[PDB]
Amino acid sequence: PHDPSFTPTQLAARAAYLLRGNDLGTMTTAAPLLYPHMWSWDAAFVAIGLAPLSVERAVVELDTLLSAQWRNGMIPHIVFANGVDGYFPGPARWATATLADNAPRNRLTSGITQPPVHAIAVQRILEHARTRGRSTRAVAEAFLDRRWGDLMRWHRWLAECRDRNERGRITLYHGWESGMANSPRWDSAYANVVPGKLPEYQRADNVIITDPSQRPSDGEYDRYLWLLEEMKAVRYDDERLPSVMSFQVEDVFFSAIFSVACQVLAEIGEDYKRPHADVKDLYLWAERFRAGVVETTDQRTGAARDFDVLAEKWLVTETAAQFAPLLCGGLPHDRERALLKLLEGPRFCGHPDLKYGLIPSTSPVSRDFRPREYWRGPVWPVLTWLFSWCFARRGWAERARLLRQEGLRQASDGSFAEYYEPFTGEPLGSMQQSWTAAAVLDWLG
Amino acid sequence: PHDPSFTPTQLAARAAYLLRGNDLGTMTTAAPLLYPHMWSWDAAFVAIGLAPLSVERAVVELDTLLSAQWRNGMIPHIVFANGVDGYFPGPARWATATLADNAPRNRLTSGITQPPVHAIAVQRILEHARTRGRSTRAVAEAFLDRRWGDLMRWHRWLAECRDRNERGRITLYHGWESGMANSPRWDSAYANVVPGKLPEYQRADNVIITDPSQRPSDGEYDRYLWLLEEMKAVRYDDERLPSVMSFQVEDVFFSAIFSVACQVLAEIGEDYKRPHADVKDLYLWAERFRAGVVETTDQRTGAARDFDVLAEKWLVTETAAQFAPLLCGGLPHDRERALLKLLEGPRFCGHPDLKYGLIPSTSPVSRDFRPREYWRGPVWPVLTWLFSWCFARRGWAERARLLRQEGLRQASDGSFAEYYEPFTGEPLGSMQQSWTAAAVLDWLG
Amino acid sequence: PHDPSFTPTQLAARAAYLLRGNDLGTMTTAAPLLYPHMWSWDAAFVAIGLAPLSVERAVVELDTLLSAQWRNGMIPHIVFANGVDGYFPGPARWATATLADNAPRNRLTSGITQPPVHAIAVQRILEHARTRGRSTRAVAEAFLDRRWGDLMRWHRWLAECRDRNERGRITLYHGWESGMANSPRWDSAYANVVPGKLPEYQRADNVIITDPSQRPSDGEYDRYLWLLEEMKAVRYDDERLPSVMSFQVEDVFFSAIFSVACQVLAEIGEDYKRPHADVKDLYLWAERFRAGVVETTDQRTGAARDFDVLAEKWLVTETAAQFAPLLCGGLPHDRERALLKLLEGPRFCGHPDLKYGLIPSTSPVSRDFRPREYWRGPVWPVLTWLFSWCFARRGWAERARLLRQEGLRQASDGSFAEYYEPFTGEPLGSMQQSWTAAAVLDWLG
Amino acid sequence: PHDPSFTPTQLAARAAYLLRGNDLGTMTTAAPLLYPHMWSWDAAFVAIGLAPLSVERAVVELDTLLSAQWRNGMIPHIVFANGVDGYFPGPARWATATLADNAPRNRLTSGITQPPVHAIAVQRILEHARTRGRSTRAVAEAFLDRRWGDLMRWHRWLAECRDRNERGRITLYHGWESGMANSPRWDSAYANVVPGKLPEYQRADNVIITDPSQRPSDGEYDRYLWLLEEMKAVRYDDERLPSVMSFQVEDVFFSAIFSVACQVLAEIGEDYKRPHADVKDLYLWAERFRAGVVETTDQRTGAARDFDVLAEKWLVTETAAQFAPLLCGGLPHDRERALLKLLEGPRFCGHPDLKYGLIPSTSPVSRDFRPREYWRGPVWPVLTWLFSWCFARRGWAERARLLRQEGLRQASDGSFAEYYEPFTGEPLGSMQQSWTAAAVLDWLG
Ligand SMILES: O=C(O)[C@@H](CO)O[C@H]1O[C@H](CO)[C@@H](O)[C@H](O)[C@H]1O
Ligand SMILES: O=C(O)[C@@H](CO)O[C@H]1O[C@H](CO)[C@@H](O)[C@H](O)[C@H]1O
Ligand SMILES: O=C(O)[C@@H](CO)O[C@H]1O[C@H](CO)[C@@H](O)[C@H](O)[C@H]1O
Numbered sequence A, B, C, D: 001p002h003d004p005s006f007t008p009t010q011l012a013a014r015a016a017y018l019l020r021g022n023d024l025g026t027m028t029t030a031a032p033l034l035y036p037h038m039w040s041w042d043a044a045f046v047a048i049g050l051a052p053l054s055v056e057r058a059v060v061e062l063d064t065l066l067s068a069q070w071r072n073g074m075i076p077h078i079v080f081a082n083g084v085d086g087y088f089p090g091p092a093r094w095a096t097a098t099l100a101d102n103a104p105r106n107r108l109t110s111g112i113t114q115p116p117v118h119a120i121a122v123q124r125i126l127e128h129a130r131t132r133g134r135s136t137r138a139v140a141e142a143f144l145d146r147r148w149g150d151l152m153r154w155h156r157w158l159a160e161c162r163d164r165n166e167r168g169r170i171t172l173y174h175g176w177e178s179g180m181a182n183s184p185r186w187d188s189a190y191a192n193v194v195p196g197k198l199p200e201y202q203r204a205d206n207v208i209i210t211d212p213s214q215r216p217s218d219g220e221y222d223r224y225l226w227l228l229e230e231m232k233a234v235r236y237d238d239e240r241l242p243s244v245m246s247f248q249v250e251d252v253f254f255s256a257i258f259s260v261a262c263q264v265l266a267e268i269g270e271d272y273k274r275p276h277a278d279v280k281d282l283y284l285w286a287e288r289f290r291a292g293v294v295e296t297t298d299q300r301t302g303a304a305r306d307f308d309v310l311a312e313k314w315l316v317t318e319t320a321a322q323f324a325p326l327l328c329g330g331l332p333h334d335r336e337r338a339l340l341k342l343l344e345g346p347r348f349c350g351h352p353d354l355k356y357g358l359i360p361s362t363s364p365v366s367r368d369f370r371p372r373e374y375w376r377g378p379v380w381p382v383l384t385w386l387f388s389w390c391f392a393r394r395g396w397a398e399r400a401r402l403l404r405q406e407g408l409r410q411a412s413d414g415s416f417a418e419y420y421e422p423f424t425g426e427p428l429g430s431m432q433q434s435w436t437a438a439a440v441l442d443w444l445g
């Protein structure tokens, strides 16, 4: 008609309807068909969206994810649903069940990790539970009793095994670990990934998303799948990966999230009387990774750089990852003002052709910008939510509110799209994406 | 805390979460455990609550109900879920699968009917679909193409087989057909139901609702189950029921709903160019049952009476059914003003001890009033919704708005209870009741 | 910026801020500068807008208007603010203070009337007061005691002096009495107004609204001002006007409003135990003017026609006044369906170039349509409100809701414009128009 | 009736209606009758409440206040409305027009100051203006050009003349300068004020508020009015006040507000390219007064203490002023956790008998607590707003949200009371208090 948008109550209802519709029982799929399994950072955001509906079911979501945690503490980025096909690479291609000595016996998983937003979900669950009364607080507190150790082991694995040199930045062995598969951030590192004898495969993602402008290329998937062959050759052994992987990058955005997550989990630990040594370690890691993020930044603009460990070079790109230091703090005053000017100016939120005042995944003025192509340009509601929540935590109440307002406007069509075209607002990627519904649910209050 | 109520967006989200949680696939249970099957008038209200979430799934709900329609047109009041136990009387006790020649081959059902609110659900589906654009309008219009004949056959069975004498009132053979099992309306008729050799049975309803003050008595269930034996003895044959049933009442509230439903379906038929003869029949029945309702009314107060066909006597009770004429219209001006004074005065919505300005199922000043006991007093959100929608259709915009406002206040605890204590607001009956969530969903807009 | 619309709470606050800003103390101006006095039907809508803010002040607004009522019962269409210039024709031009024996001694007023929406405002005040508690109900009931007789005298003057032949239509002697100065409705009647020696004047309205496309022409004003000379020459004597006025029309929209207002006031009289003879007269007039409206209607479409008393001919134009029978009822079922099809189709609300699904003052497909020119095309929020309220009173809950939704969308710029361009949504006429704020407040209060 | 609360849109409308009603033209009175003039920190909150309604009028409010600024930079706490009586002490009693060489020539003012919340109001005006488009941004930027120097002179007067020893705390010479006339904070200092021959007077405040339990005693007013005699005797000369005043206290809450205001104004200066030397001074003062606040704090709880300059002793009381360090920051991590535990525990927001989870002006468990008596116990909406805004600025998003939620619940009666009884929620003090409406509008605008 004249207005296809939904009212706040309609939109909240449809978002909860979606989330319950993607529930398999104890895990929520990231999307109905494109991503028909549990993903790690999606599961954190799903728990955030479930917290206003059922603290009990939000806790179940994190319990299911943690039940897939590897023996060394790694949370793998996919927990596969039993008997479900339709996603590639699936369990047979990872072969972690037969090759990975640390993989769980009772879940099929991938063999790589994803960003540690999980502590933020725990905070939102606790915040909801404290408004709901004693029986609900008891549910959330029982979850802390049951899973505090597992959360510690997750943060410790990141701090000790992916920051072996105590640089305060997380090393990745796959671009998929960044959450941003085809981000321009990784192009120069991927250009040095030379596949050898790569076993034949058929993609499934572009059978579901048929528009070729919206997904990575075959050449990019060849490199993604070649890194799997390198990992499988060493049976996913942490100790051997630095010797064999053709892709080794320090991810400054993942690092900033980790800093925030450690500080959040330390505050939880203080409030719920968790072991002093754990809280002390969490604060130490929060500070170490805050400093590691700051060390990457341009001394003029504050923009954070990734680092190619193999090439030994800073990776200078124009993506939303540059704003990593805004999430965790630590910049000198003048540098942070410069970085905020970059965020709000014509290269990002201030670009005159954007439909919404939101943060594109790649700067529209970058040569790498592609308005439809996944992480090369589109606006991702999950990043809107993460930036808005971290900005509110910095004390930037109006900046956070504006992102939430624009994210709700963008989402008001009810498509709950994976990402959106930055100029037209066209929904792109999968529809019915669980963390887009969760973002709306958290925002609407 | 200081305030356990939910905001409108929170409440809408939780109501949709509930509705999707009670979805078995193609049917929604009336409640998670007490009523773990599809009920007929509940399914209409569920379709109303689904319409803002998914016109496609709202249509599915009515398709599933109509697929259980009997060969003679009757919509049975329970469509049992395959393999589901926990409700008594269940499929084995009804034995319609082996005894009822008109029962559907591919569904297990009860052998009695329930009120014809279904046309109202169709109207709400169409209203939503018209705001959503062409593909959604096509879904709703395709449903009309597919099911108009079945809806006609339902209304025709009521008009021809339950009003054989063309009195403009529907005859019931079981109090369960009224929707109000233990209403004081039926006490004097039930007092003449003398069970003979009644086969042993174990109730399930009071294993789930253990508080004896909230459910009918064993003596009442003995009579409910004896009527089943009388119906089974004649193989549920319409032609033989008047000769054998110990309970035969004309239900003025069911009759008023039928009048409204015929008028609504006639208006749909005009708008979507359905057969002229059908629309003509629907308007004729709407007028006949409006007149039949008016004929029951007290000439002073307008209060509508039920009629005991066996005793040949008007049934004078003080329940919400007295307000039947307000739903369908037809009263003389002075009589309708008197009936509205009764509704708004100290015997119903104006009673000084009520927590909310809502319509109790039995007048709190009646000797039959029991504040916890099912239809003998509690406030039912489903009746709030039905009265508010019919009042808005009369043009009584402020009266309708006040009922909606108070119903939302009552529902703001998020219990989605089956019924509520009228003085304290305590949630009673089953929690997580589907038509209470549907009422909230329709209201919140 | 990206979206310059206000939220509902922002919009409600700004609407109330406007209405208080236009308050001179005991009267609210219709606008800040263009209309810096009290107008009669505006004052009724202002009272509706004040009722959610202050029942006491809403009652004051109507008391002030009724203190200007003429000795014969006429409510004049302007009550001038003492010492205020800036509007023409002003008190000196009307000369009612020196020429009109029935004009009030203690107010300066115009010498013509305006539509009787006042009973609708009384109903809204009473509805608000009944939600607010005993002290506020007493305020509203005291107003009824004080002003019931004046309201009766107003209705009686219309029924007896402007329907002298008991035709059930109100005769007007000036297009300004219709509320729609330059409606195409009056063009052929105005073509038969031939001014004599008209005293020189200077307009004020087009000094404030300088865009010539938005106000009537000088030629139109010459005729408006000449009719004043004709009234002044007979000292505004009711009995003489039929013999001297060059403009005499039966206004079918005014007539339908009067039918509704009589029925509304009759219901108020019953509820508050006013004299039975008054209630009986009100219902008689409601019926007479309903029938009078229906008698004008097109046999195919149901559209209502005005009547030129001097030319003795039906006035056939394509304006929103055609929809008069929808307000008061009375059409046969088939013809009202045809009239609603006209309303919702491509000649009015369904025209494909309209920005909002609202009723233009003149059909966009009529040769008379002018998209900027006052009553010749623009969308008026006051008419949106009146149609929405009357439609809800007919029982057409969804139709009323859609008009309210589109009216709120149009008003969400916060300009509170007098009227809006139908295709672009550009605000036109005066900004900060009191009855546009009142519509918004009622729709949200 | 059943619930006398207003909806958010109703409440926002009534709040704006109130604020416009208290507008005299270019100044808004703090209340209709009790406070019928402009007060300094009220005017800052009024500007915050006007910003969502009219950036232009919000700017006017601060322009009017700053036009009363004294020649030395002091903003006086009252700007009297010309020709208005009804408040005591009025202009004749202050005699600043004849005795104070620094008082403005064209305004009548008091001779003491009030807390510097004004920069917070400027920030809110700028935030609103940036959402409204170019013309509105220009209005706000023009105000900065016109008044930046005056704002600097205000901050400089506080830092240089009320912190002469650079201790980082503001000295007051009257309890009225704290904003909290009869706070238990000042009881021991007031016990050392011995009036001489005090000129006879009659109070006005307790003729308007007649309940003696709600205002200070005559004995307290004798001391308030005697301090005026001491100031008048030295012609309000800043350099003489330390030698003659019987009341000299360092106000830690005023100091923390000043710290925040300096940081806020410094950020405004950076964003709008104000002189670098001014920004540098503002950040220096922000740091100095932060440290000055922290130096007062209890080593166990972190609670901030006031200081009696004459008695040379720390003032230890149990009032909301203890929470000053939460506003400005600076406490060590462990002590701020202790201070938040005090805030949220049973001595303040977690007291089990409080109707709302809000901060009482005096702890309910203190021997000084009086639940009706002005600053000795009642909950003040203005403090709820200030704490919520400062908490959001610290990053404590959920804590700020809970204060806002409870503040809106308390205000939903629409009384807009000056303060509220902490246990019953009874509205106390003046009704229709401007800064209570402003808090509501900001929380909803
Ligand atoms: O493209 C893919 O196959 C997967 C690879 O893990 O990645 C996409 O989908 C995941 C689930 O929604 C997200 O977690 C990622 O952030 C997003 O990029
Ligand atoms: O008590 C029962 O076993 C059943 C008998 O049909 O009845 C109750 O539950 C049904 C499903 O919710 C409702 O349809 C009825 O209105 C309500 O009275
Ligand atoms: O143009 C004018 O001078 C006057 C003449 O009465 O008319 C306009 O202003 C009035 C006040 O707003 C409205 O009552 C009318 O409906 C509107 O047409």
Ligand SMILES: O=C(O)[C@@H](CO)O[C@H]1O[C@H](CO)[C@@H](O)[C@H](O)[C@H]1O
Pocket (backbone or CB within 6 Å): D030, D031, D035, D039, D040, D041, D042, D077, D176, D179, D180, D181, D205
């Ligand atoms: O009691 C009084 O006469 C005055 C003295 O300035 O103080 C009260 O009123 C002011 C205006 O509302 C507020 O600024 C104060 O905070 C409040 O305590």
